[PDB]
CSV table of C-alpha atoms in Angstrom, one decimal:
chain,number,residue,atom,x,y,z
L,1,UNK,CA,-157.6,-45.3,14.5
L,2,UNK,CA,-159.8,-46.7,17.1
L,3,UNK,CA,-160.5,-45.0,20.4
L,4,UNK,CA,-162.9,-45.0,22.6
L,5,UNK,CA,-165.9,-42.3,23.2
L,6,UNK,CA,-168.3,-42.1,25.5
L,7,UNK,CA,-167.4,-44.7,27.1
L,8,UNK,CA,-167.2,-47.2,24.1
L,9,UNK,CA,-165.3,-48.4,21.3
L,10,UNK,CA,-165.5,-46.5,17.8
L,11,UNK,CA,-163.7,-46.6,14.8
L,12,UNK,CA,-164.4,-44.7,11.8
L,13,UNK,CA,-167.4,-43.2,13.3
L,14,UNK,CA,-168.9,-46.3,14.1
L,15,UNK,CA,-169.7,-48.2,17.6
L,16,UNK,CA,-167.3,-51.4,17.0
L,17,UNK,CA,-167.1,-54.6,19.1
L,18,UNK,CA,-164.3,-56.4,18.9
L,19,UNK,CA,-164.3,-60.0,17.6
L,20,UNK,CA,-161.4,-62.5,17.3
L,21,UNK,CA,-158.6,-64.3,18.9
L,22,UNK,CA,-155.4,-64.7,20.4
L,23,UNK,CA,-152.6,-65.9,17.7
L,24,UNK,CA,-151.5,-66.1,20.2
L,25,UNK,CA,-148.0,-66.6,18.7
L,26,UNK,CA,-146.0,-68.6,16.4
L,27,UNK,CA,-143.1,-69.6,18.0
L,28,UNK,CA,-143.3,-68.7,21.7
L,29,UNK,CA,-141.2,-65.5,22.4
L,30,UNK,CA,-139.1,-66.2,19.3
L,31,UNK,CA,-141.6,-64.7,17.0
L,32,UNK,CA,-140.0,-60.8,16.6
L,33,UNK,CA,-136.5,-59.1,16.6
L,34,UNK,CA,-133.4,-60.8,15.3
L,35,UNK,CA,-134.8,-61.8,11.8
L,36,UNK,CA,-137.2,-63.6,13.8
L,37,UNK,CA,-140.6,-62.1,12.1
L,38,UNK,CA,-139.5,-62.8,8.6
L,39,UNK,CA,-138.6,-66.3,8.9
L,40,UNK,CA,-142.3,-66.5,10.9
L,41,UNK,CA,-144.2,-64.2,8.9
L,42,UNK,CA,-145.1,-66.8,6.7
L,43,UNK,CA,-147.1,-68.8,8.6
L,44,UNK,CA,-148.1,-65.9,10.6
L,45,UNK,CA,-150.2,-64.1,7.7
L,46,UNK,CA,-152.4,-67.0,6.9
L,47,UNK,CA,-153.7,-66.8,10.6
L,48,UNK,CA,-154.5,-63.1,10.0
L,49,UNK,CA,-156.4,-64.5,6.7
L,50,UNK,CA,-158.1,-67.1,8.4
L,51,UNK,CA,-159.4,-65.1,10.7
L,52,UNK,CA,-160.4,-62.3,8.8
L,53,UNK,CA,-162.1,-64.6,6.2
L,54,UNK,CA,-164.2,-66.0,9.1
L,55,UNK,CA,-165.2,-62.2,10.1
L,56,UNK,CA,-162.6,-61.5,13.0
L,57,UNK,CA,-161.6,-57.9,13.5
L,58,UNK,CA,-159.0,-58.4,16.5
L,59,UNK,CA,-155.6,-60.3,16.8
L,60,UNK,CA,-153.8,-60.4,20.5
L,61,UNK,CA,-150.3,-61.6,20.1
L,62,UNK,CA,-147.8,-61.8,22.5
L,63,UNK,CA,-144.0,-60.4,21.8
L,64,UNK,CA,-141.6,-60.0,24.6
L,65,UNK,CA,-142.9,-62.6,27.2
L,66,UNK,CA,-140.1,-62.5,29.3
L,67,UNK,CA,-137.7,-61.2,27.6
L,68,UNK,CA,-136.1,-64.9,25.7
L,69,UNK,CA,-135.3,-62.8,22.9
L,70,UNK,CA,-136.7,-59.1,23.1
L,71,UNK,CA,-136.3,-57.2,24.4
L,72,UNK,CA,-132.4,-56.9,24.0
L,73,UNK,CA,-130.7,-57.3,27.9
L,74,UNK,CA,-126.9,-56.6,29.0
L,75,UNK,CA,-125.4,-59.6,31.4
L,76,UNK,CA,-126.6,-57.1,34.7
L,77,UNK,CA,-130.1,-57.2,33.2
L,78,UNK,CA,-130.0,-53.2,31.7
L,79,UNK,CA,-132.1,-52.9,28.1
L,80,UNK,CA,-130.0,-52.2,25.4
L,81,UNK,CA,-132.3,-51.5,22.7
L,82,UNK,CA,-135.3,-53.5,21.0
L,83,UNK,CA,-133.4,-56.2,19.9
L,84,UNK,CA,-129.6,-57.2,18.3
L,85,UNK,CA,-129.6,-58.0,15.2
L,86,UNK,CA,-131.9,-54.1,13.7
L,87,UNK,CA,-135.0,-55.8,12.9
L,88,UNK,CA,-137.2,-55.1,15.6
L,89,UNK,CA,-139.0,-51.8,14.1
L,90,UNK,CA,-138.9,-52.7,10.8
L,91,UNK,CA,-140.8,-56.4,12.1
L,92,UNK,CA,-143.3,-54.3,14.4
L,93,UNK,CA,-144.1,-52.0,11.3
L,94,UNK,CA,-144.5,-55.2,9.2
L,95,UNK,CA,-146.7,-57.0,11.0
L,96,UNK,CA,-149.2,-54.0,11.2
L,97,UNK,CA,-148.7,-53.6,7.8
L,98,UNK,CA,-149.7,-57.0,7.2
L,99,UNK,CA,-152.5,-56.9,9.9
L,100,UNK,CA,-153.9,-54.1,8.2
L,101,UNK,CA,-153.9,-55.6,4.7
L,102,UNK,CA,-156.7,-58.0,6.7
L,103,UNK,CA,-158.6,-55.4,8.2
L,104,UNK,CA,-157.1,-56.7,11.5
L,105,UNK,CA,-156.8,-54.6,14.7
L,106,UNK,CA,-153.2,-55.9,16.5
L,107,UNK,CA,-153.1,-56.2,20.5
L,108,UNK,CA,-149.4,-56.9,21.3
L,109,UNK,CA,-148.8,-58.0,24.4
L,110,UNK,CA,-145.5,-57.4,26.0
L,111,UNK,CA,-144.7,-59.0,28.7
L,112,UNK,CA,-146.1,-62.3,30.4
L,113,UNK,CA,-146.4,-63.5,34.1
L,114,UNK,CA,-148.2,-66.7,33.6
L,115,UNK,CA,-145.4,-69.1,33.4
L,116,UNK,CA,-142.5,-68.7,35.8
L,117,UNK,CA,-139.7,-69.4,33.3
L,118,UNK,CA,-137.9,-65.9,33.1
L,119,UNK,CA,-134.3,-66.8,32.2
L,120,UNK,CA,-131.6,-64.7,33.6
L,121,UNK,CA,-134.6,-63.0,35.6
L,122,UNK,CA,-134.7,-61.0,33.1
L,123,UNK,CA,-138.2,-59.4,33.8
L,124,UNK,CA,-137.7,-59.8,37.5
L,125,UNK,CA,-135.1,-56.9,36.9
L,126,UNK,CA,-137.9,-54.8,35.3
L,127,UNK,CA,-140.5,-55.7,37.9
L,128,UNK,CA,-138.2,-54.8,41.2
L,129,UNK,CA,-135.5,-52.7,39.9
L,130,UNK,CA,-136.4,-49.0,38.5
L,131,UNK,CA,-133.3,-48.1,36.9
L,132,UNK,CA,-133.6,-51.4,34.8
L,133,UNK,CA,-137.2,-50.7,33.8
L,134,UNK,CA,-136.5,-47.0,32.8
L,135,UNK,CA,-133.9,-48.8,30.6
L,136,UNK,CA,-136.5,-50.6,29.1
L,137,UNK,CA,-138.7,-47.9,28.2
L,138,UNK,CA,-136.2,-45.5,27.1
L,139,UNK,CA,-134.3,-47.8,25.0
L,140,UNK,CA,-136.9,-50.2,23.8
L,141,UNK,CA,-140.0,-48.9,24.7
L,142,UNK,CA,-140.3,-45.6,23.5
L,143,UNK,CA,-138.7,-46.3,19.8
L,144,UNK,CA,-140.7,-49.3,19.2
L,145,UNK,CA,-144.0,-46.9,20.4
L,146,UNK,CA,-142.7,-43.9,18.2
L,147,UNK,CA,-141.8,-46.5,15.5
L,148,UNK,CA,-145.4,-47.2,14.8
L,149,UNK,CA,-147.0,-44.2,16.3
L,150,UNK,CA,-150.8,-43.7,15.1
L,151,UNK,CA,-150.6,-47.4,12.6
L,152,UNK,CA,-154.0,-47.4,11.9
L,153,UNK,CA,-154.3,-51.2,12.6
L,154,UNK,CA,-152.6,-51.2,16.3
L,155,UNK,CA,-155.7,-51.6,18.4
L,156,UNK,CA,-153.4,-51.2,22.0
L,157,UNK,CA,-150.8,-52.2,23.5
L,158,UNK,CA,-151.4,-54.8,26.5
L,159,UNK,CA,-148.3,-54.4,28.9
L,160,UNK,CA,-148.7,-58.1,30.3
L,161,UNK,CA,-150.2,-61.3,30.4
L,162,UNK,CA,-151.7,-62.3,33.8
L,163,UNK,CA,-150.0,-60.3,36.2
L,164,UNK,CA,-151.8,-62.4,38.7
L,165,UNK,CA,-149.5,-65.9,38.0
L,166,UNK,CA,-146.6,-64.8,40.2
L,167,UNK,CA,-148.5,-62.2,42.3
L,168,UNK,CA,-148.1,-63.0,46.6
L,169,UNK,CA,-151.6,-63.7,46.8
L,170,UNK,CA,-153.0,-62.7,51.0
L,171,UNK,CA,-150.7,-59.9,51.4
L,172,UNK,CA,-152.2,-57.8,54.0
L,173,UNK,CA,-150.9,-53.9,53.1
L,174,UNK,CA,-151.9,-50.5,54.6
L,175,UNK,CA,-152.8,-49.0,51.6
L,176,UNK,CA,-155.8,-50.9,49.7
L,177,UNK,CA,-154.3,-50.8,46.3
L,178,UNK,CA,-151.6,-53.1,47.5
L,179,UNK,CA,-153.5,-55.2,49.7
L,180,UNK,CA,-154.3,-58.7,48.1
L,181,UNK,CA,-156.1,-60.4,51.3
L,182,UNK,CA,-158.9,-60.3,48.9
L,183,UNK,CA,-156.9,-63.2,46.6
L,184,UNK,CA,-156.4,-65.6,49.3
L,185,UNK,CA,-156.8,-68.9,47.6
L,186,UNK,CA,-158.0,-67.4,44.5
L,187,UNK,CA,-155.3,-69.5,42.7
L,188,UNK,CA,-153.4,-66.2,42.1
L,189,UNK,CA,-149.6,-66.3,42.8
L,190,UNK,CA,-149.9,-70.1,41.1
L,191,UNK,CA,-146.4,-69.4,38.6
L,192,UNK,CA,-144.7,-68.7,42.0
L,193,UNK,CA,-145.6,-66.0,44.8
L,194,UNK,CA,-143.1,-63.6,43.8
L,195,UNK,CA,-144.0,-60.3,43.5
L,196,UNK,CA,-146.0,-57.5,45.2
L,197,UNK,CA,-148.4,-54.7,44.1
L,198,UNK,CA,-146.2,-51.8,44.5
L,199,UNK,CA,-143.8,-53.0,42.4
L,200,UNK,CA,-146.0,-54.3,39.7
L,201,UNK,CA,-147.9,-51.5,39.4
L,202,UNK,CA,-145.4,-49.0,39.1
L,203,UNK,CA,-144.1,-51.4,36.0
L,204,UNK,CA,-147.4,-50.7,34.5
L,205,UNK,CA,-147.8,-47.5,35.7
L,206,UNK,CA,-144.4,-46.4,34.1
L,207,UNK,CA,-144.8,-48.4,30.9
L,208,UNK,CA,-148.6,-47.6,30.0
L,209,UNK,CA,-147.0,-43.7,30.8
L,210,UNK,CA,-144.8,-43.7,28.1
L,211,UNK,CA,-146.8,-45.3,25.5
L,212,UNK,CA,-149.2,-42.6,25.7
L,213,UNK,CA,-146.3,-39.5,26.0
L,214,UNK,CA,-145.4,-41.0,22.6
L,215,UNK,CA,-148.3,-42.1,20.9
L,216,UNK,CA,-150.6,-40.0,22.5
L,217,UNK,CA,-153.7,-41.7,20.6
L,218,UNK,CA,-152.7,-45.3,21.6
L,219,UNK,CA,-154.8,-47.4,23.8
L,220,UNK,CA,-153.0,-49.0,26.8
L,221,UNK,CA,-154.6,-52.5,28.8
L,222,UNK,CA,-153.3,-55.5,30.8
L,223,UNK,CA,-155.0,-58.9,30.4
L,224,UNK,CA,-155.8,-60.3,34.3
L,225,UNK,CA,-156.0,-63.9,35.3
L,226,UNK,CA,-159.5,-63.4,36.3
L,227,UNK,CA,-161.5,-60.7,37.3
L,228,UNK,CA,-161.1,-60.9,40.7
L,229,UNK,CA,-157.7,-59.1,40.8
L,230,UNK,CA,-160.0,-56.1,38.8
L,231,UNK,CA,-163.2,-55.5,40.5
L,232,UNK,CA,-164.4,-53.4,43.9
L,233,UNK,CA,-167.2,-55.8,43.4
L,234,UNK,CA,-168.0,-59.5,44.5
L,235,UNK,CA,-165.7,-59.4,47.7
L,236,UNK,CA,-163.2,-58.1,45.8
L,237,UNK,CA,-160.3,-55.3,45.3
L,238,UNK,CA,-159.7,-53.9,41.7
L,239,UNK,CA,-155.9,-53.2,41.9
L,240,UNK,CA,-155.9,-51.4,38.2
L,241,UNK,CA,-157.8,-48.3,38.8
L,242,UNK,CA,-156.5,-44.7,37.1
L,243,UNK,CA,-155.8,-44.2,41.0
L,244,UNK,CA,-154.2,-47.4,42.0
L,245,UNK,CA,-151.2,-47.4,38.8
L,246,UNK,CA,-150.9,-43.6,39.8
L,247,UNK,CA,-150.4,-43.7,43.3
L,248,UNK,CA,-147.6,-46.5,42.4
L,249,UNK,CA,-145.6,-45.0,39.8
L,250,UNK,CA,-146.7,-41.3,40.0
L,251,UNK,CA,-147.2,-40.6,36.1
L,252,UNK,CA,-150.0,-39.2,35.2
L,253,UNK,CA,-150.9,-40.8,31.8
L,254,UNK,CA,-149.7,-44.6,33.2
L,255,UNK,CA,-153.4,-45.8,33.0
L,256,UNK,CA,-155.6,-48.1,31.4
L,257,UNK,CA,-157.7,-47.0,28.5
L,258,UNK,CA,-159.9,-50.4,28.6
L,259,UNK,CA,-159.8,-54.0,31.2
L,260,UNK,CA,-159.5,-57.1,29.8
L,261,UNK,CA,-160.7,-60.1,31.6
L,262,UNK,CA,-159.9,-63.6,31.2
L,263,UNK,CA,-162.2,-66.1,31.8
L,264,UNK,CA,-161.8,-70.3,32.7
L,265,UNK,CA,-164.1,-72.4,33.9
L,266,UNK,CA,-162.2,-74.9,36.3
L,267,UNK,CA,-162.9,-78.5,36.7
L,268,UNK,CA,-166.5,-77.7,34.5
L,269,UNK,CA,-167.7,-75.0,36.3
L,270,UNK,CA,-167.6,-71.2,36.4
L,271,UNK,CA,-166.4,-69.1,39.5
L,272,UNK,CA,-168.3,-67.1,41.3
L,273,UNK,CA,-167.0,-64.1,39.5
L,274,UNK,CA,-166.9,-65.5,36.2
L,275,UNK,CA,-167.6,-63.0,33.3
L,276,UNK,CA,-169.7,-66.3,31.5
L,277,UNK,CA,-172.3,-65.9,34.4
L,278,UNK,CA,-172.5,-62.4,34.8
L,279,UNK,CA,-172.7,-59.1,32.5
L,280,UNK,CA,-170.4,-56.2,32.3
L,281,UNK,CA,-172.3,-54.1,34.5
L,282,UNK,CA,-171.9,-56.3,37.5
L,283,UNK,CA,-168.0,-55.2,37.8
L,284,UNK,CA,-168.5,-51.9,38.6
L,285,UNK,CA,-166.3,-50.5,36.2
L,286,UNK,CA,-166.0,-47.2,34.1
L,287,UNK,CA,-164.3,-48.8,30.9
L,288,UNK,CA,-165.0,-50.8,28.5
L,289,UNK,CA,-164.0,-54.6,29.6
L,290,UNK,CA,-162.8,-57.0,26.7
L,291,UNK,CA,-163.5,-60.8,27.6
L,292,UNK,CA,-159.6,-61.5,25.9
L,293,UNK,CA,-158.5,-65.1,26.8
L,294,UNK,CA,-161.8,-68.1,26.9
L,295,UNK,CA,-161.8,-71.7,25.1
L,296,UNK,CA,-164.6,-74.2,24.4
L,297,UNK,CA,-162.3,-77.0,26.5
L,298,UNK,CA,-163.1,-74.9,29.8
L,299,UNK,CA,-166.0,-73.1,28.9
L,300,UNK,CA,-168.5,-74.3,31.4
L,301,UNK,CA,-170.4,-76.5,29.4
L,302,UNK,CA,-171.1,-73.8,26.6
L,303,UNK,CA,-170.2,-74.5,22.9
L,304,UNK,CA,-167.4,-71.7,21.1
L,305,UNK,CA,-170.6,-70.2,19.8
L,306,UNK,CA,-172.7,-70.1,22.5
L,307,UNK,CA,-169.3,-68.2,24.8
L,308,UNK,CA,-168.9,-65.5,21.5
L,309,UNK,CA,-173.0,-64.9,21.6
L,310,UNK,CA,-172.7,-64.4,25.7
L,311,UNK,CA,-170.2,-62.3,25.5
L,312,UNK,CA,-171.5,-59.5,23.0
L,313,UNK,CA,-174.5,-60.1,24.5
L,314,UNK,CA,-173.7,-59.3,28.3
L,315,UNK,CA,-172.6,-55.8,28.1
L,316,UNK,CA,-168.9,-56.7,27.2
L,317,UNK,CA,-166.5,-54.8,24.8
L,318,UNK,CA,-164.7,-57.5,22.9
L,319,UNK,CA,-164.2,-61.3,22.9
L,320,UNK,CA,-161.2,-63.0,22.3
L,321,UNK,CA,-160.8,-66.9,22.2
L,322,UNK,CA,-157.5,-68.7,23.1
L,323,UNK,CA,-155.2,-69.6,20.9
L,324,UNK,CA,-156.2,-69.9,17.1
L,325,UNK,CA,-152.9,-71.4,15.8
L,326,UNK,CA,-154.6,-74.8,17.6
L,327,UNK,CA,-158.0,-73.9,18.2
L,328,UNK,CA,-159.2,-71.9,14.9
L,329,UNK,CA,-161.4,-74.6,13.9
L,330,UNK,CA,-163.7,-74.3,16.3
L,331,UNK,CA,-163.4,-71.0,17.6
L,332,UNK,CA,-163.7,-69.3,13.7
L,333,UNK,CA,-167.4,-71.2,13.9
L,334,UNK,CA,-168.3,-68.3,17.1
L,335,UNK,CA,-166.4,-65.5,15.3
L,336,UNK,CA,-168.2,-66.1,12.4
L,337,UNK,CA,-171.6,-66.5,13.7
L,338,UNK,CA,-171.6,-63.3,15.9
L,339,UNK,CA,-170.0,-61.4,12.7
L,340,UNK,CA,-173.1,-59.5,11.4
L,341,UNK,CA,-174.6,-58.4,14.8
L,342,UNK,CA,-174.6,-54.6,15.5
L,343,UNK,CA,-176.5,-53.8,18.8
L,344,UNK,CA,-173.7,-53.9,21.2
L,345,UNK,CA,-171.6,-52.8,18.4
L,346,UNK,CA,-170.5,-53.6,14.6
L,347,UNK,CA,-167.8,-55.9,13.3
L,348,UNK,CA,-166.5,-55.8,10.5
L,349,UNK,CA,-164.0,-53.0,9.7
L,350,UNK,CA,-162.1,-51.0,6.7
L,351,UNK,CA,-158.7,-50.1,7.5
């Protein structure tokens, strides 16, 4: 199963970089539990051919997202398991089994904070409340984790889309792992300023915590907004350090085994901070760092080829272009031309 030694990503004994896209679903939040996965599954498995065929090793797809039909909520916002209808496992299983029949490395992403759109605020319980979020993990969590413990083609769990879209952005706090005076008009907090770091962190804290009690081999990240929200460097504050998620939530194993940056241009042009105009070195980090969300349409000016080719060749872990149900087209074209390089890492896999 893939892990990560000496500070890099290896599976079966080999460096590997990972290559691919984001599905990055098939119908938005109604893709898993409750029958849903069968009646999707066939149009999901072509995209896992289509992307293996063009030399892709890495699907992130996105199952919770908050919470429209998994996981399974009372009417005071409590977990009551992974789903209603007893399909949930059996559809988590399935689509790693079908994954691996593609030699495709799965990133589920739980939860997303991108979108303010949370019916029956149904995350917001999970975010603010701790009783409700232990409900989560024990009742949802945990037998969806031990369900699929040690699937050779789960590649890690990401516990949330852009954390960033409904984080209060110029919060002065005390204590620097809160403190998000950094972010002022960064555009974080753009879904809604709801939400502040304590609270957010301890939700990944607790979740990324009991993951790894019970799949102790799985790999646990978050995708941010942008790396400002993830870096000491550049005028910034990196709120996801080891020490930042402990301090919140207090469990020791609630930690990140890689980062995962996504990267826009806006209006035509790249940030200051902007993983397409820097390398991975710059960040300051001690983990790998995936380049997980980018697209041609805000891209800087670069072609789909020209952003896979920067990003194995700056340093980073993994690229990841946005949304292949629309965009595979194009973005197979930059998978498929970066497929047979090896020196920050090989490609293609056997699982």
């Amino acid at each position: 199963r893939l892990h990560i030694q000496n500070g890099h990503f290896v599976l079966n004994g080999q460096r590997v970089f990972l290559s691919g896209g984001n599905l990055p679903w098939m119908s938005y939040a109604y893709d898993f539990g409750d029958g849903q996965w069968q009646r999707n599954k066939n149009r999901i498995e072509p995209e896992f051919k289509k992307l293996h065929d063009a030399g892709g090793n890495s699907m992130r797809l996105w199952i919770h997202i908050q919470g429209e039909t998994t996981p399974a909520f009372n009417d005071q916002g409590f977990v009551t398991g992974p789903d209603k209808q007893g399909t949930m496992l059996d559809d988590m299983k399935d689509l790693l089994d079908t994954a691996k029949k593609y030699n495709i490395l799965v990133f589920p992403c739980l939860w997303n904070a991108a979108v303010n759109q949370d019916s029956h605020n149904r995350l917001d319980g999970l975010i603010k409340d701790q009783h409700k979020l232990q409900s989560y993990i024990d009742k949802a969590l945990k037998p969806i984790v031990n369900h699929v413990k040690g699937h050779v083609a789960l590649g890690g769990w990401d516990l949330m889309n852009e954390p960033e879209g409904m984080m209060i952005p110029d919060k002065h706090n005390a204590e620097k792992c809160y403190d998000t005076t950094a972010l002022k008009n960064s555009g974080a907090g753009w879904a809604g300023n709801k939400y502040l770091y304590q609270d957010i962190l301890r939700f990944l804290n607790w979740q990324a915590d009991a993951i790894k009690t019970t799949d102790p081999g799985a790999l646990v990240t978050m995708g941010v907004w942008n790396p400002k929200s993830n870096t000491d460097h550049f005028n910034m504050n990196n709120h996801y350090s080891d020490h930042c998620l402990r301090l919140a939530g207090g469990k020791q194993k609630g930690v990140f085994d890689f980062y995962q940056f996504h990267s826009y241009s806006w209006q035509g042009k790249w940030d200051e901070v902007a993983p397409f105009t820097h390398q991975a070195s710059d960040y300051g980090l001690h983990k790998p760092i995936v380049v997980g969300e980018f697209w041609e349409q805000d891209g800087g000016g670069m072609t789909i080829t020209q952003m896979f080719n920067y990003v194995y060749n700056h340093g980073y872990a993994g690229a990841w272009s946005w949304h292949l149900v629309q965009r595979g087209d194009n973005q197979r074209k930059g998978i498929t031309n970066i497929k047979d390089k090896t020196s920050n890492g090989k490609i293609p896999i056997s699982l």
